[PDB]
Nucleic acid binder design. Structure first.
Lengths: 248, 308, 49, 149, 49, 147, 235
RNA sequence: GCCGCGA
C-alpha cells in the first residue's frame, strides 16, 4: 500500500480510497498506457547530444531504470539546448544532479505523475498530499446542479474530461447546423466531404431528464443556436454538469 | 435640539441605479440611519413577481416543447427574472402568444390594462421553426419576501389542474444597496453629516418611494418603544347524560350520584361504582354496554373538567 | 487526568486572545477609567481600541 | 458575500491552494466585472477589443498566443458577452500562475494587490478591524444530504 | 428503538445542557408520550383517534 | 501575504549547497567513506533546516515595528497566522515551518532519509519530485492510521 | 398582508434595583430585532442629552501630577471619583459649585454648597478621605450639559494654558447610560418559526429611569424620521 | 454475502 518509486508516470500517487482500500486501488496517470505484454509505460522525449528532440519513446518500468531521465521543470533554449550545464534528474530510483551531456530522456510534461481526478485541482503543488487526496476523492461525489457553472479558475483539463467521457454530443462530421431543438439537432454536412450517393445529414437525439445509477439526473442542452458553422469534433450539446464543452 | 434630515438632491443614474441624499444629519446619526434603512430595504420591500405559469402543451417542468430551443425549466428560470409594475391589482394574468422565428421577449406580452414592463428586451425563450407557436399564461402576484413554491400549501386548497407550474417568488425589487457618509457643505454650522444611499433594483419601485416606505416601516416598528408601560374537549363528551337511552332505574341512580355529564361517568373504574346503592350487576353491564356503543370504555383519565 | 475536558477551542481561543492583547500605540493611551463598563462604552463607541 | 469560511482550517491543513484560488478567482471576477461595466455603456468595439487583448497578453512568458486582430468584430462582441461573468483562466497543475502574476492580474482589474478588502458587518454596520480575503471559490455540493441521513 | 440518527451541525446559541433536535425527528421518538398526552387531555378518546 | 518569507533563506540554502559540493569533492578525493559523507550531509541539511526555521520565526514573531509617543518601538506581531499559532487555537510551529520555512528532510520508503530535502515551502510551489517524495510520507501515515 | 408587519406585544420589563433593567420584546420580524437593537444602542450610547462635571479647580498646585498636599488619595483618583458623579441641572447650560471641608472624615456629594437649581442624585458618593488629618480641602467643580461622550482630548479655549489648568481636562460622560447591551434570540408565533425576540439590558448612572431612557432614545429616533413620515402618514 | 462510500 506504499508508493513505490516506479509509480512516477504510471500510477497516480494522490488519488486513492481512504479507509479500508488505501493503496489497493489506484488511478492511471494521464499519459500512462499498457505495453504489448501488459506492463505500464509512460512517454518520454529523447535527448540527443545536448538538444532535446520532439521524438517520443514509451518506457516501461524495467527500461526507464537504466537511462537518466530529465525533469519537466527544466528550462530550454530556442534551439532546445539546456540553459544550465547542470540539471536535476532521476537515474536509478533516485534523484541527483547531472551534466547536460549525461541526460538520456526528458519528462514530457508536468502532469505526467498526476491522474485525471487530481489534474483538475488548481495549485495542487501548494496543497498537502493528504488534503489533495481528500479533494480528489470528493470531486467525484459532487452532483450536477440546475445550471452548469464554469470554474473561474481551472487547469485546462476540463475540456478533455468533458469531451472524452461521452457525456456530451460531439459532431462526427458536422457542417452547418440546420435545425436546433431542445431534443434534436439536425446538421447539413458540408459538400467538401461527402459519401457519394443518397447525400445525407446528421441527426442527434439528445437524452432528456433520465435517471442515473445514483438516482441523479442526466440532461443534455444544445450549445448551437441556428446556422452556426460546426467543425468536426465540435460540441453540440452539454450533458449534466458541463458548460460549453467544459467540465463544470 | 437636533436637525431633521431632509430628502434633497435625489438623482437617478439609470433605470435601476439610483442615488438618494439626506443633507442635514448630526454626528452619530448617519451610520445608524444608513444601516437601519439598508436592513429594512433589503429585508422587506413590497414588489411583484411571477407566481405560476400555464403553457398550452406542457405538462410539467421537466418536459420539452417541440420547436422551442430551451427546456421548460429554463423557461421558468427566465420568467423568474421578469420584472413588472402593477397598479390596483394583485393577480394580473399576462397571456402571451407568438409564432415565428427568433427570441420571444416581454415586449410581445399582450398589452394589459394597467401593467408596465420595466424592460421589453428580457428574452424568455426561442422559436426555431416557422410553423411552431408558443402560448402561455403567467400569473403575477404582489408580495413582500422570498416565498418558495414548495413551502406554500394554501394554493392547494383548490385542486390545481395538471399543468399549473409553480415557480418560486422573490417579491424583492431591491437587489443591492450601499450607503456612505460625508461632511456637509454647511459652513455656518461647525460640522454636519450627509448620507448618500445608492440603490440598484430591477426598476419596479421608485427610490424615493422606497426610502419613504422604509422610513415608515421603521417608525411604526419604533412606535412600540415610545410608550413602554407594562410595569375535556371531545364533542362526544360534554353531552347531557340523558342521551345514552338508559333505563329508569339508572336515571334515579345517576341523579343521586351527581352524574349529569357523560364524561364524568367515563372516568369511574368498574370496581368503585359497585358500592353505589342498588347499582345492579345486570344494570351495570347495561351501563357498560351503552358506553361501549359510543366507544368510551370506562376507566379513562381526564385532566380538567369545566362546569360547561 | 482531572483536567477540564470542556474547554473553549478554535474561534473562541482566537476571540479571547485577540481581545487580551496590547499595542504600543492605539486609540487611547494612559486614560484612567472608573470601571469596566466604561471600557466597553469606549470600545463600542469607537473612541478606544 | 455568499459563503463564509473559517480561516482556522487553512494553517493546520496546509491548504494554501484555497487562498491562492480565492485570490485568483477574485481577480478573474474583477476582470469580468470590468468587461461587464464596459459592455453596459455600449462603447465602441475597438476599445473593448483592446482591453481584452491587454488582459489576455498579461503574464510572464506565457505560451498563449490568442490575438483579437484576426478575430471577427461580431466574434469579439460574442466573446466579450460570454465572459462578462468572469474571465475563465486556466492554470495547469505543476506550472501554474505565480503570486506576481496573480497580483498583476488584480492590479489590472482595479482590485487590491494583497487580495483583501475592508468588510462591514451586515447587522451592526461596523467595519471589521482586519481586512478579510474575499474571493471566488468553486464549491461542490456532495452527495451526502440529510434527506437521506 | 426510540433511537434517531442524523448529521450534526453547530449551534452557538445553545446552553451547555441544551441540544437542538429536529421536530421531525421528534414526534417520532416521543410518539407514545404524545399518544398518552392526547388521551389524557380528552382530544382523542380512543387510541385509533 | 500572511506567510512572511525570510529574505536570508536562499542565502543559507546556497551556503548549504556549497558545503555539499565541497564534501562531494572530498568524496571524489577518496578520503571519505559513503557512510561518513551521508551522515555529514544529513547533519548539515538538518542544521540548515533549523537555522532557516529560526530565522523565519524571528522575522515573523516581532514583525510589527510600530512607533510610540517617542521615536519607534517593536512588539509582538498581529500576523493572523502567527496569532493562530501562538494563541493555540489551531496549528503549531512545525506547520508554520512547513508553510513558510523549508519543508525539511523527509522520507518514508523504508524509514530512511533522502539526501536532498524539500527546500520549497507551500507558499511557493513544489516540484514534481518534491511532491512525489512527500507522497511517501503521506501514504505511510494514512495507512498507519487506517490500520 | 403587504405593508402589514408584526408588532411586538406583551413586553416584559425585569427591573433590578432602580438603575438596572432588562426589557424584553417578542415577537419581531426576522432581522428587525438586530435593526432595532443596534439603532437603539447606538443612539443611547453616542448621542443623548445629559450633564456631567467637566472642570475642576483644587487650591494649591495646579499641575497634572501633584503631591495632593497629603490627602491620602492621589488627585487622579479624585478626578476619577468626580467623573462618576451625576447631577441634574435645571435651566442652565453651565454651573459652578464649590465644596470645602475641614476636619478628618470622608467627603460626600451632599457636602457641596447648596444650590437650589442643581440636584445631586447620590448624596453619599465619595470623592476623597480628607487631607489626611487636621487639614482642609477645597474643590471648585464646573459642570455643563452636553451630549454623548467627549473624551479629554484637548481644551482649545481661552489662551495658552489658562483654560487647561482651569478645567484640568476632566473626562465628561454626558449621556446617562452606564451600559447598554442588546441580544436577539429565536421566537415563534403560530405557524411561523423564524421570529426575533429582543432583550435590552441597560444600567443607568441615575438621574433617569431606564425605561425613560429607552423612551427618549425611541422618541428622538422617531422624530428624526418626520421628514419621511409626515406626508406618508396613515393619520 | 461481495462492490463502492461517510465519520
Amino acid at each position: 500500500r506504499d508508493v513505490h518509486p516506479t509509480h512516477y508516470g504510471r500510477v497516480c500517487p494522490i488519488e486513492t480510497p481512504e479507509g479500508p482500500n488505501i493503496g489497493l486501488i489506484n488511478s492511471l496517470s494521464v499519459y500512462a498506457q499498457t505495453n504489448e505484454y501488459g506492463f505500464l509505460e509512460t512517454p518520454y522525449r529523447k535527448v540527443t547530444d545536448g538538444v532535446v528532440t520532439d521524438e517520443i519513446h514509451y518506457l516501461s518500468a524495467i527500461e526507464e531504470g537504466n537511462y537518466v531521465i530529465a525533469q519537466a521543470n527544466s528550462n530550454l533554449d530556442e534551439e532546445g539546448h539546456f540553459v544550465e550545464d547542470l540539471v536535476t534528474c532521476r537515474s536509478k530510483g533516485e534523484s541527483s544532479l547531472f551534466s547536460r551531456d549525461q541526460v538520456d530522456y526528458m519528462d514530457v510534461s508536468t502532469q505526467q505523475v498526476v491522474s485525471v481526478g487530481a489534474s483538475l485541482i488548481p495549485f495542487l503543488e501548494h496543497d498537502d498530499a493528504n488534503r489533495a487526496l481528500m479533494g480528489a476523492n470528493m470531486q467525484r461525489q459532487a452532483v450536477p446542479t440546475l445550471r452548469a457553472d464554469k470554474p473561474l479558475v481551472g487547469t485546462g483539463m476540463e475540456r478533455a474530461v468533458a469531451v472524452d467521457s461521452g457525456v456530451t454530443a460531439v459532431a462526427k462530421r458536422g457542417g452547418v447546423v440546420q435545425y436546433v431543438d431542445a431534443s434534436r439537432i439536425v446538421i447539413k454536412v458540408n459538400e467538401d466531404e461527402m459519401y457519394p450517393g443518397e447525400a445525407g445529414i446528421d441527426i442527434y437525439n439528445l437524452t432528456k431528464y433520465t435517471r442515473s445509477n445514483q438516482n441523479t439526473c442526466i440532461n443534455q442542452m444544445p450549445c448551437v443556436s441556428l446556422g452556426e458553422p460546426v467543425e468536426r469534433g465540435d460540441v453540440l450539446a452539454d450533458g449534466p454538469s458541463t458548460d460549453l464543452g467544459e467540465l463544470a | 435640539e437636533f436637525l431633521k434630515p431632509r430628502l434633497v438632491d435625489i438623482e437617478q443614474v439609470s433605470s435601476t441605479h439610483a442615488k438618494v441624499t439626506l443633507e442635514p444629519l448630526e454626528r452619530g446619526f448617519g451610520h445608524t440611519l444608513g444601516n437601519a434603512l439598508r436592513r429594512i430595504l433589503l429585508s422587506s420591500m413590497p414588489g411583484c413577481a411571477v407566481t405560476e405559469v400555464e403553457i398550452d402543451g406542457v405538462l410539467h417542468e421537466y418536459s420539452t416543447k417541440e420547436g422551442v430551443q430551451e427546456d421548460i425549466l429554463e423557461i421558468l428560470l427566465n420568467l423568474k427574472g421578469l420584472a413588472v409594475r402593477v397598479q390596483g391589482k394583485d393577480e394580473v394574468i399576462l397571456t402571451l402568444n407568438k409564432s415565428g422565428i427568433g427570441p420571444v421577449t416581454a415586449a410581445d406580452i399582450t398589452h394589459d390594462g394597467d401593467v408596465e414592463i420595466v424592460k421589453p428586451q428580457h428574452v424568455i425563450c426561442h422559436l426555431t421553426d416557422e410553423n411552431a407557436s408558443i402560448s402561455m399564461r403567467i400569473k403575477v402576484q404582489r408580495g413582500r419576501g422570498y416565498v418558495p413554491a414548495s413551502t406554500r400549501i394554501h394554493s392547494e386548497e383548490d385542486e390545481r389542474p395538471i399543468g399549473r407550474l409553480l415557480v418560486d417568488a422573490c417579491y424583492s425589487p431591491v437587489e443591492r444597496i450601499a450607503y456612505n457618509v460625508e461632511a456637509a457643505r454647511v459652513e455656518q454650522r461647525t460640522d454636519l453629516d450627509k448620507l448618500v444611499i445608492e440603490m440598484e433594483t430591477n426598476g419596479t419601485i421608485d427610490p424615493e418611494e422606497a426610502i419613504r416606505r422604509a422610513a415608515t416601516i421603521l417608525a411604526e416598528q419604533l412606535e412600540a418603544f415610545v410608550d413602554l408601560r407594562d410595569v375535556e374537549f371531545d364533542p362526544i363528551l360534554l353531552r347531557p347524560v340523558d342521551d345514552l337511552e338508559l333505563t329508569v332505574r339508572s336515571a334515579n341512580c345517576l341523579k343521586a350520584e351527581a352524574i349529569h355529564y357523560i364524561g364524568d361517568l367515563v372516568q369511574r373504574t368498574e370496581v368503585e361504582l359497585l358500592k353505589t346503592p342498588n347499582l345492579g350487576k345486570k344494570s351495570l353491564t347495561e351501563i357498560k354496554d351503552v358506553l361501549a356503543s359510543r366507544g368510551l370504555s370506562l376507566g379513562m383519565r381526564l385532566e380538567n373538567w369545566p362546569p360547561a | 487526568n482531572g483536567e477540564p475536558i470542556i474547554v473553549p477551542s478554535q474561534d473562541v481561543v482566537l476571540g479571547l486572545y485577540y481581545m487580551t492583547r496590547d499595542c504600543v500605540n492605539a486609540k487611547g493611551e494612559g486614560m484612567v477609567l472608573t470601571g469596566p463598563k466604561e471600557a466597553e462604552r469606549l470600545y463600542r463607541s469607537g473612541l478606544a481600541s | 458575500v455568499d459563503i463564509v469560511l473559517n480561516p482556522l482550517g487553512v494553517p493546520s491543513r496546509m491548504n494554501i491552494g484555497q487562498i491562492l484560488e480565492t485570490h485568483l478567482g477574485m481577480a478573474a471576477k474583477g476582470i469580468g466585472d470590468k468587461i461587464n461595466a464596459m459592455l453596459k455603456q455600449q462603447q465602441e468595439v475597438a476599445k473593448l477589443r483592446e482591453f481584452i487583448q491587454r488582459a489576455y497578453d498579461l503574464g510572464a512568458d506565457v505560451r498563449q498566443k490568442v490575438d483579437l486582430s484576426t478575430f471577427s468584430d461580431e466574434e469579439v462582441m460574442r466573446l466579450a458577452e460570454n465572459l462578462r461573468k468572469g474571465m475563465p483562466i486556466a492554470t495547469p497543475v505543476f506550472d501554474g500562475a505565480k503570486e506576481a502574476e496573480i497580483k498583476e492580474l488584480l492590479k489590472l482589474g482595479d482590485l487590491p494587490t494583497s487580495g483583501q478588502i475592508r468588510l462591514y458587518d451586515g447587522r451592526t454596520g461596523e467595519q471589521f478591524e482586519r481586512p478579510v480575503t474575499v474571493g471566488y471559490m468553486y464549491m461542490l455540493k456532495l452527495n451526502h444530504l440529510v434527506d437521506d441521513k | 428503538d426510540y433511537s434517531g440518527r442524523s448529521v450534526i451541525t453547530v449551534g452557538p446559541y445553545l446552553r451547555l445542557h441544551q441540544c437542538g433536535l429536529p421536530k421531525k425527528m421528534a414526534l417520532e421518538l416521543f410518539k407514545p408520550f404524545i399518544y398518552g398526552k392526547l388521551e389524557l387531555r380528552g382530544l382523542a378518546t380512543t387510541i385509533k383517534a | 501575504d500572511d506567510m512572511v518569507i525570510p529574505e536570508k533563506k536562499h542565502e543559507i540554502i546556497s551556503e548549504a549547497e556549497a558545503e555539499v559540493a565541497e564534501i562531494q569533492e572530498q568524496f571524489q578525493s577518496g578520503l571519505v567513506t559513503a557512510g561518513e559523507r551521508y551522515n555529514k550531509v544529513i547533519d548539515i541539511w538538518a542544521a540548515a533546516n533549523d537555522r532557516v526555521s529560526k530565522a523565519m520565526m524571528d522575522n515573523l514573531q516581532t514583525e510589527t515595528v510600530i512607533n510610540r509617543d517617542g521615536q519607534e518601538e517593536k512588539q509582538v506581531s498581529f500576523n493572523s497566522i502567527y496569532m493562530m499559532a501562538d494563541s493555540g487555537a489551531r496549528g503549531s510551529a512545525a506547520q508554520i515551518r512547513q508553510l513558510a520555512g523549508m519543508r525539511g528532510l523527509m522520507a518514508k520508503p523504508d524509514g530512511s532519509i533522502i539526501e536532498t530535502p524539500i527546500t520549497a515551502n507551500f507558499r511557493e510551489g513544489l516540484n514534481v519530485l518534491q511532491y512525489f517524495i512527500s507522497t511517501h510520507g503521506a501514504r505511510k501515515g494514512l495507512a498507519d492510521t487506517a490500520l
